Amino acid sequence: KKKLFIMIVGGLVGLRIVFAVLSIKKK
């Protein structure tokens, strides 16, 4: 069930991308 594992860890790693977009939006 690799798809389920990738869903759990993907939301965690996604914070890097979301944080980058939040930072550039302020600039």
The DSSP secondary-structure symbol of 13 reads: H
CB atoms within 10 A of CB 12: 8
**3-class DSSP state of 27:** coil
Q: Up-side HSE of residue 12: CA atoms within 13 Å toward CB?
A: 5
Q: Is the four-CA dihedral 11, 12, 14, 19 of positive or negative sign? A: positive
Give the integer Cα–Cα distance in Å for 10 and 26. Answer: 25
This structure was determined by: NMR
Length of the chain: 27
Give the integer Cα–Cα distance in Å for 14 and 22. Answer: 12
% helix, strand, coil for the chain, step of 5: 95, 0, 5
Nearest to 25 by CA among 17, 6, 12, 9: 17
Tokens read off for 13: 């790693």
